[model samples]
Target: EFAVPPSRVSPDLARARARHLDWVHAMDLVRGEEARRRYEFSCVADIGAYGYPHATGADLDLCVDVLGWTFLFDDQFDERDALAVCAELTDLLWKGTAATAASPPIVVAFSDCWERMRAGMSDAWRRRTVHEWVDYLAGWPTKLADRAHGAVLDPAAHLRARHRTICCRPLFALAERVGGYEVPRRAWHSSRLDGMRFTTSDAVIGMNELHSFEKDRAQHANLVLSLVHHGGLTGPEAVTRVCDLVQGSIESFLRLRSGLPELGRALGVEGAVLDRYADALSAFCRGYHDWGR
Candidate 1:
């Protein structure tokens, strides 16, 4: 059902997974047996290795930690005061020192990841990444409120919110980081780059919702669920339709991607830099499908 090409995994996967496991044990973020079991079953390190197949060494290790933290933090919103949690995280994103003694393990762990992710990156990358994080953290409270009240969004709104909440944009910044080149400021904010990211984000969202529908069916967080409830489609119909959309996104990505050379010329970017940037995003689209499979 997917049109994206098969993904290439990093040669560093085993090492990255080992680093994540060791860090998880050392961090001791898991409280009880149930939490420990959940962490063990998460396959989170594998996600980083697959999703950022270009990353290696410290970059790959940092990817695993941050990706693992996203899953862990998502679980916290259900039980904790979400507004307060969002504020704490928001402060941390802005100040980089907002985590106090009272901050939870998740927040503290993010502090460590933040320091690593920001190290040696340029001001443009750092600022853009910071904005992406703020928007992501800001989306949580409203999403949680909708879930709490049993509200469902229409397809358009659902995808918009999902785009923000999926946490892929910040992860895309890591793609640039691993590639060792920051996209020039002009091209970074250009509509062309945004369009490419838009398609890739949809493809990733489709993969996530399609793969996790059965697991999170009762929760109002899935695109398939929104289609069923709001679009008046049966489960199978919704699933099929989402599959088609995913294929379309992949096709559109290819079309848009073909024009990147022209974009590189227009922006006065180096050929090698644009190629690596394009490859990073391609790996993101294909690698996400690979990991979900």
Candidate 2:
């Protein structure tokens, strides 16, 4: 759980907002359908790989296939169905007492949806977009759990899982709140929100991962240890190590170059809207780091 006092936006963030606008404008210039498709698929696959390895081994190729299926069958963005399904799945995962009974398939489907949406971008762009999406999805449980009292089973783990369940809420809410109409731009806006959400959420996840990297390695051999560890021997010693790791990981600098134009092209955003809020994105990450510290 985490908390922020809710203050005015920072000067650094103001700069970021301007940069983000620039990126968005550039993305408007890329108009090739094939190229855009490729970028979209690539971004989706990259996101899948980074966020949910347990569900799909984070295989980009396989993730692409899943996205293709989703596009073929479920791109309608039906709000009612999507919301109903989300609620049912949340109950299935959280209220159902047994872990074995929880719907892994549903969870995997959610991950699949995320990856398919970003399947066509460059690895760097994909990483940036996906990291933001991850952060957005992680926010609910982070905020809600922070306000909650008492302990549940593995509070941190429970909060993490719960976050995934409600991550879609903000997007849906924003869409409904802005106007209950189907504006593709709104979806794109939500995507940006996702990035903002991830900046904070990923920081927390990164810290937790860094703190437990050694224990994880002892139990399960993997490359994440190499990606995360900085040779620190204790938890506090590892804080900066984790921060550095996050700063370097796919999560941090994924969109340093592409901005909103690249993002728009990747996401099918139309009309006169392209900008780069990289500074804001960076501030999002930095804010989380400072808060966590």
Candidate 3:
């Protein structure tokens, strides 16, 4: 687990945690004989909601549900499936990683979420969200096939795919949409934005590999294993090595985001919305670092 100073923990995040718990319980996530004790404990729905400090009430509830769904499916894949389950889920549902069982109300949950988000977003945002989700689905089958063949991913290839898997791009689209501060397409693609995106992506993903080394190692898919074999370091040493990389990534994220407004202004693409977006990104980073702290 990550440790951090007390200052990293935001008061806003503290409030959102309580709000999220109340909202989810009200939804009656499981009506009958609910899931296992471990499953309930492992849900960790608070993790994502706390990471988005600006979300509260219903907006905060949406954040919690999205992350809850994400964690639920990840556990399903990591623990039970690892092979045919995700593929079968996709064949039956057109979504590889959502909803294992259909309920009259629960059945429409995913669809309700889609419309809810799409209603407030532009075509571009919607497209980006869908494409990111598609990217998310694509990784599962490939990883499972590799596992079936007992294959090791090339180090670069592993980082590339895992990078996408870690960042959870739909969240980025939501970050922009839910905040009501849409970054213009030109400003969105500017070099500074690109810099922030890549660094933040690496920071988010690399840190996960560091924290998840034990579980990933057991599953034989640990990124640290790549360093152990190719980088010629022992497991412990690889852990330290990747943590250092993640630390560097955090610094890079800070540097890039801090400069975003100035860079956008100098380039003549800066707008009030972009400035707010930068602050939102900063708040997001702060909340995430604070949570694991």
Candidate 4:
């Protein structure tokens, strides 16, 4: 189950990849040989980014640059002493086109993307995204602290935290830019809608965890580690167990989508916007399928 991808990696990523690379190149994200090295290693071109396929080049650029920003910053995990720098970066989020003296290329890169996205997308989209963005930023340090303490989470605990920390909602939320419309805050924040998003994001996270299982095991952050220690299974067995969950998650996605039409009607949302939302989620899931694992 862990071995099978949840869906097809869209060939359409070629378009997104091209536009994203050009944008990053222009922005000095690929400024040096090492920056290019880091960019490649971050796998921004990988299947996880398929959620951006519906995005126009202007919007896709912002989305994937943020994707690159996350991976690059995530790789900076060993610097336990840079809390001040991290704090400044977090503060940078609230600032506008007027720049700040934040250190680390991430501050400039991400702050710029934050500004561009706000400028391009609707206010409703911006409002829906900021909370998730702040939560994601808050999560990064916690992950560092947990790794510092050699703490392993229970899978149940892991699922709840992983949705925000893994950083899918904000990225997938970019789909609104693709539609060029705002989902009313009411429908956007509904329990049924939000719960669907939470589960789907978890599914993608599980797919990511499965893809990087070997690498994560080596890095000491494997998702299945709790199962290894507490579920009486070996490492491989634990991974397989999670694979079973991934498959279930995909089936859950289909079932959930089938129910969305009624939810859309009950909420009085038109059909197209609901399709936009569901397609974004499905594309996100597909991006992981046959992803280069």
TM-score to true structure, per model: 0.93, 0.28, 0.78, 0.84
**In model 2, which range of ten residues has the least summed lDDT?**
172-181
lDDT of 4 by residue, 1-293 (tens): 33322454434556767666666676555667777667767575554355544554556556667777776666667465456656775565554333465455566677777777677666556666876787787776667777788877877766766776788777767666555767667677887667667767767787778767778777666678878776778878887787777777767667767887887788888878877777777766666554544
Q: Extract clashing residue pairs from model 1.
A: none
Candidate 1 residue-pair clash tally: 0
User: For candidate 3, lDDT tens digit of each residue in 104-157?
Assistant: 223334444555566677777666667676577668666666677776666677
Give per-candidate clash totals: 0, 43, 0, 0
lDDT per residue as tens, model 2, 1-293: 22321222222333333332332233232236665555454332232222222222223234323333333222323144444444553443334222233433434444444444444434444444444444543444343443354332342343355344323332222212222123344434566545544544545456555544676456431124333333424545545555664565434445532455555676777424333233333433344334333
How do the residues 103-134 of candidate 1 rate in per-residue lDDT, one tens digit apiece?
76777788888888888898878888999999
Better of 2 and 4 by lDDT: 4
| Candidates' C-alpha lDDT | 0.80, 0.38, 0.61, 0.67
A best-first ranking of the candidates according to their TM-score comes to 1, 4, 3, 2
For model 2, state the Cα shift of residue 97 in Å: 24
Error (Å) of candidate 4 at residue 215 is 2.0
Q: Flag the better candidate by TM-score, 2 or 4.
A: 4
Best by lDDT: 1
- TM for candidate 4 is 0.84
Write the number of the candidate with greater TM-score, choosing between 1 and 2: 1
